[PDB]
């Protein structure tokens, strides 16, 4: 039951926010689903969706190239750091920011959609009036109670997974490319994926501040065919380190699996 999320939260300290949502049946399970949590690198998911929306509108090309300069490179930029002094396609920037959480890649993409304010306007226009993108990397990872900058709610981000991966916000080609990027994610193997039962294809995007906060947002498609689930998980201010928080996220996957 949803009380199991409260029990799990007690082992972790901090605040655990979970939204498990099945659009085709209306079933929904979770904890703290309307509270604000720092997005950390989960912001890279709506960022990529906004880029694809701009491409679909004919205002940007995925083959457009963006110059990379030394001053763009910041901590954990594993693809972009190889292209200083040349350029990269928007498509390759999106892939890098999603599958390995490349930070410079996110900072190079943000201006193409009018920055954090443009990302927030896109989210508002698509129906999410909760999520606020205010800063770029790395300061977007800051969090303070009462400061909504760079925060979402579990319900809002589960909603965005639905909007962008399952709804018609994006063209069929863009929606499938975004799903493929999430399926190819390289950073989630010890998190929700490790607790979910067999028989599900997972696309996810993680975040972690390396200190007290870890997040994972996922779409779950049944390999047997049928209707997908969305699962958002935000753990903020935990007493547990990265390995311990990964264990909480695994356990969220196990609890979610009981519904699948």
Total beta strand runs: 9
Order of helices and strands: HEEEHEEHHHEHHHEEEH
Strand fraction: 15-25%
Tally of alpha and pi helices: 9
Give me the secondary-structure category.
Answer: alpha+beta
Fold-level CATH name = Beta-lactamase
Protein name: Class A beta-lactamase
PDB class: hydrolase
Keywords: Hydrolase, extended-spectrum Class A beta-lactamase
Assembly: monomeric
Describe the structure.
With 260 residues, the chain is of the alpha+beta class. The chain has one domain (3-257): Beta-lactamase (3-Layer(aba) Sandwich). The chain contains nine helices and nine strands. The chain has helices at 3-12, 44-56, 90-99, 103-109, 115-126, 154-166, 172-183, 192-195, 242-257; strands at residues 15-22, 27-31, 37-38, 65-67, 87-89, 151-152, 200-208, 214-222, 229-236. A five-stranded antiparallel sheet has the order 2-1-9-8-7, sandwiched between helices. Strands 3-6 form a two-stranded antiparallel ribbon. A two-stranded antiparallel ribbon has the order 4-5. Helix 2 packs antiparallel against helix 3. The longest helix has 16 residues, at 242-257. It is globular and about 50 Å long. The two termini are 14 Å apart. It comes from Stenotrophomonas sp. KCTC 12332. This is Class A beta-lactamase. The PDB classes it as hydrolase. The entry lists the keywords Hydrolase, extended-spectrum Class A beta-lactamase. The assembly is monomeric. Crystal structure of extended-spectrum class A beta-lactamase, CESS-1.
């Amino acid at each position: 039951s949803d009380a199991d999320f409260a029990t799990l939260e007690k082992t972790s300290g901090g605040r655990l926010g979970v939204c498990l949502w099945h659009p085709a049946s209306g079933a929904r399970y979770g904890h703290r689903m309307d509270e604000r949590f720092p997005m950390c690198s989960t912001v890279k998911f709506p960022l990529a969706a906004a880029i694809l929306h701009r491409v679909d509108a004919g205002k940007l090309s995925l083959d457009q190239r963006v110059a990379v300069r030394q001053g763009d490179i910041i901590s954990h930029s594993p693809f972009t750091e190889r292209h200083v002094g040349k350029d990269m396609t928007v498509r390759d920037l999106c892939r890098a920011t999603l599958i390995i959480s490349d930070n410079a890649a996110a900072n190079l993409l943000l201006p193409l959609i009018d920055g954090p304010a443009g990302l927030t306007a896109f989210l508002q226009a698509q129906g999410d009036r909760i999520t606020v993108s205010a800063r770029n990397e790395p300061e977007l990872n800051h969090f303070a109670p009462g400061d909504p900058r760079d925060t979402t709610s579990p319900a809002a981000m589960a909603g965005n997974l639905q909007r962008f991966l399952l709804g018609d916000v994006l063209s069929p080609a863009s929606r499938q490319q975004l799903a493929d990027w999430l399926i190819d994610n390289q950073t989630g193997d010890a998190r929700l994926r490790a607790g979910l039962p067999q028989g599900w294809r997972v696309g996810d995007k993680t975040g972690s501040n390396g200190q007290d906060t870890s997040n994972d947002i996922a779409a779950l498609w049944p390999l047997a065919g049928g209707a997908p689930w969305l699962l958002s998980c935000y753990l903020q201010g935990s007493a547990l380190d990265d390995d311990g928080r990964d264990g909480i996220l695994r356990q969220v996957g196990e609890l979610a699996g009981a519904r699948l």
